[PDB]
């Protein structure tokens, strides 16, 4: 068991909690199951309250607030006490009393700490704050020594990625098939990917959640994996026969169904420009391999160029950009790049090019950015999940991420595409420890 605690400079109260950061389950947010211990000797006449404030901050505004009174517990609202509350009260003396908070959704992130930001105020951010204080009436003077205030965070975790894990296994095993030497490694890789494919066929893609189990989209989705398992079966048969090279040749056919899955279910973009003094268009197509990426995990960008003009492509630029619009009444909007690649690849006239570019966005190189969105060991702000019909005007800070692939052409705007993606965090007796 692990609980936290903060005392006061005058030592007239203490606040206990079971957690630091409270997860957000989209539909509901975990409650704040606090505990308060008070010494009635000084507070012989007065009372004690506990307050929660969700504010944006000298320019300062609030977004949500709620108050609860410890005693007398005669109007015992939320009378069902959670287990930890009862155990904490019973373990400690008879002067500990319970309280509970429940909150509607809001936005949890902060902004970077640099002089002269891009918004109103300095050292801004949105933070939650548990606070208890002692008095007789709710307007009197506040004695900081006889008070307390804590900070809690509304972290929000990424959904399950079983399908992504299955596809990652499939791709790694296909690679080790391609680099194999003898029959045993080929057999082991094929067995692993067969298991992964069968597992993946059960799961449902994020783009058909509202579609029914018997919808034709689901039928086509399952048909694709049926074909994939058949191709793996053919490759396994050839490998078990004894032919290693033929097994590899049969395994190469999986790239076609991988491409078919990408074009239908993965982020993709395509543009086309045909200049004057030219006859056929220039085509650029990119695609990311996953829709969800974790903080620090590399981000891989496919790129395809089929030039048909008389000009030549000089270099390709791959970048990851942060879009952070401030959902206040001022509706300020801005963006800042995070990661960047500057490969010097060239595309000849009437030629084709293809490569995979992998870049990792993280804060070490971005310490000097002026308005980059931070979490709250801090890292870049996780992408905000979309509103479920809620008003966007009072959300707060909505952060999202996009990826850009731009070509540069000699004898001279350029050509580029966007690929939105999601950057988030993965879902993971008693002694008091300092919070």
């Amino acid at each position: 068991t692990r609980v936290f605690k903060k005392a006061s400079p005058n030592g007239k109260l203490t606040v206990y909690l079971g957690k630091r950061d409270f997860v957000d389950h989209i539909d509901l947010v975990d409650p704040v199951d606090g505990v308060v211990l008070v010494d009635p000797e000084y507070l012989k006449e007065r009372r004690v309250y506990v307050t929660l404030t969700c504010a944006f901050r000298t320019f300062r505004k609030d977004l949500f607030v709620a108050n609860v009174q410890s005693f007398p517990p005669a109007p015992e609202d939320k009378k069902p006490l959670t287990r930890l509350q009862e155990r904490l009260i019973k373990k400690l003396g008879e002067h500990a009393y319970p309280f509970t908070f429940e909150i509607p959704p809001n936005l949890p992130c902060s902004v970077t700490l640099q002089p002269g930001p891009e918004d109103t105020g300095k050292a801004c951010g949105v933070d939650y704050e548990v606070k208890a204080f002692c008095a007789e009436n709710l307007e009197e003077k506040i004695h900081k020594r006889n008070s307390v205030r804590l900070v809690i965070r509304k972290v929000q975790y990424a959904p399950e990625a079983d399908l992504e894990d299955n596809w990652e296994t499939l791709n790694d095993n296909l690679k080790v098939i391609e680099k194999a030497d003898n029959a045993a490694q080929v057999k082991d890789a094929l067995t692993k990917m067969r298991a992964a494919a069968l597992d993946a066929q059960k799961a449902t893609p994020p783009k058909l959640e509202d579609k029914s189990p018997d919808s034709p989209e689901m039928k086509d989705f399952r048909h694709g994996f049926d074909i994939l398992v058949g191709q793996i079966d053919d490759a396994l048969k050839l490998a078990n026969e004894g032919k290693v090279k033929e097994a590899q040749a049969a395994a190469e056919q999986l790239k076609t169904t991988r491409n078919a899955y990408i074009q239908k279910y993965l982020p993709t973009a395509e543009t086309t420009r045909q200049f004057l003094m030219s006859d056929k268009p220039l085509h650029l197509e990119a695609s990311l391999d996953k829709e969800i990426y974790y903080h620090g995990e590399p981000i891989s960008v496919n790129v395809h160029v089929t030039n048909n003009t008389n000009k030549t492509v000089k270099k390709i630029k791959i970048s990851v950009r942060q879009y952070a619009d401030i959902c206040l009444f001022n509706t300020a909007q801005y963006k800042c790049p995070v990661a960047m690649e500057e490969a010097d690849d060239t595309v000849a006239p009437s030629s084709t090019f293809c490569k995979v570019y992998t870049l990792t966005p993280f804060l070490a190189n971005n310490r000097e950015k002026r308005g980059l969105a931070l979490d709250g060991d801090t890292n870049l702000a996780s992408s905000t999940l979309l509103r479920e019909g809620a008003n966007r005007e009072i959300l707060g800070i909505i952060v999202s991420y996009k990826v850009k692939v731009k070509l540069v052409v000699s004898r001279g705007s350029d050509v580029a595409v966007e690929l939105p993606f999601t950057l988030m965090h993965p879902k993971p007796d008693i002694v008091f420890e300092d919070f």
Partner: antibody
Amino acid sequence: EVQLVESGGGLVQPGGSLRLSCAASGFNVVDFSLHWVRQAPGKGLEWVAYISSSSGSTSYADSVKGRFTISADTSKNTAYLQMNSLRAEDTAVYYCARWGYWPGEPWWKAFDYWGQGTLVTVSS
Amino acid sequence: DIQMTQSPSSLSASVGDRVTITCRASQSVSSAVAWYQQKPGKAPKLLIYSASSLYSGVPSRFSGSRSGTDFTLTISSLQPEDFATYYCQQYLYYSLVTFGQGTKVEIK
């Protein structure tokens, strides 16, 4: 109805040879894959070999990889498992099983219909 | 090859009680596990295919659950005709078929 029948069980000297058949009635063999499962007296099940009869594909257990040979015919609806020199550690009952092909439900109903079993014993 | 182990070698219970048999696989098999029942002197009989689906004809007191590489078969209220040896099996592909060791149920 659907049923599996096998024959050929007998006593053979070590280094001897014996033929086992898996006759199927009520269903054509070419629509299913047939396997051989061996159970020692007092021990668990063990898988021996199989054939497909649609592409001719065969495979064998690592214990009888080089010795046994499996083949089938369509007109007679029978699967034959030739036994070469026997090492006296294979004195066990022998069951025949049926497993359907991949696309759909028949693959998931693995070994839904078995046989009754035959006894092959090796001694001196 | 993929090895599959059964934890309880022998289990004892009376009629009407609850009994559970567990089975673990060394390598991931995506619900490609089946349970069989073998009375002394007869052929094996399939009970649960795909680790959760009850085959036709089998009574409804059987049920199987999968959690990762852990498969459990339960008989809610076993009867005198439920005493036999049960076996685990994986069927990911044709050439990779392995069976677990027996579990025996007796009368306490």
